[PDB]
Amino acid sequence: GGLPRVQELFEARVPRNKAPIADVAGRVRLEESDKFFKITIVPDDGGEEVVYDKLSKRQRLRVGVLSDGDHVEVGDQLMEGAADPHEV
Secondary structure (H helix, E strand, O other), rough: OOOOHHHHOOOOOOOOOOOOOOOEEEEEEEEEEEEEEEEEEEEEOOOOOOOEEEOOOHHHOOOOOOOOOOEEOOOOOOOOOOOOOOOO
């Protein structure tokens, strides 16, 4: 979170602590595993459910804060962190 972060962005590098971006739009089914997180996106498209299996409980969520049933637009960030520029 500083000059290294700025250098991280201009250099097009994968962030230290990553974070998923929604691959499709729709409501989310959120589950807490043992010392883990699982976020499943039920798309408005009515198609294949997109699942993000394991996310460390330390990264928290994007604020407000995500809860079960919240609608998610495509490019929205899920859990707090730095999203992969190559991913968006």
